[PDB]
């Protein structure tokens, strides 16, 4: 039994990594920090042990530890009305305009 990792879940996990690393309230001692914070993990590689949430065939969320952070699956631009967003702004949809 295996489940597929969509590009959405990888982006959420990569956002989770930079939140752990760039923590202004992180403990001064790197020994007390987690493995994600101590080794400065910036990508998900093979052989990594994680906790994942899946529905049917696909996976939804990935966390490094038992109790961790829930990264939002949307940009904050989608959490306001599209009329209230800047008239000329940025791209908050799926895919890259590049």
């Amino acid at each position: 039994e295996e489940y597929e990792i969509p590009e959405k879940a990888r982006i959420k996990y990569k956002e989770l990594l930079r939140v752990y690393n760039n923590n202004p309230q992180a403990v001064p001692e790197s020994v007390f920090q987690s493995r994600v914070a101590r080794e400065n993990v910036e990508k998900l590689k093979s052989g990594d042990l994680v906790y994942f949430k899946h529905n049917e065939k696909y996976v939804e969320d990935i966390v490094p530890v038992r109790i961790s952070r829930t990264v939002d699956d949307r940009m904050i631009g989608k959490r306001m009305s599209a009329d209230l967003r800047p008239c000329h702004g940025d791209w908050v949809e799926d895919g890259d305009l590049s």
Binding site: R35, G47, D48, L49
Partner: peptide, 13 residues
């Protein structure tokens, strides 16, 4: 980090 699998004794109830 689990690079090498390890056999250990586990007890369940």
């Amino acid at each position: 980090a689990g690079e090498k699998p390890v056999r250990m004794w586990v007890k369940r109830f």
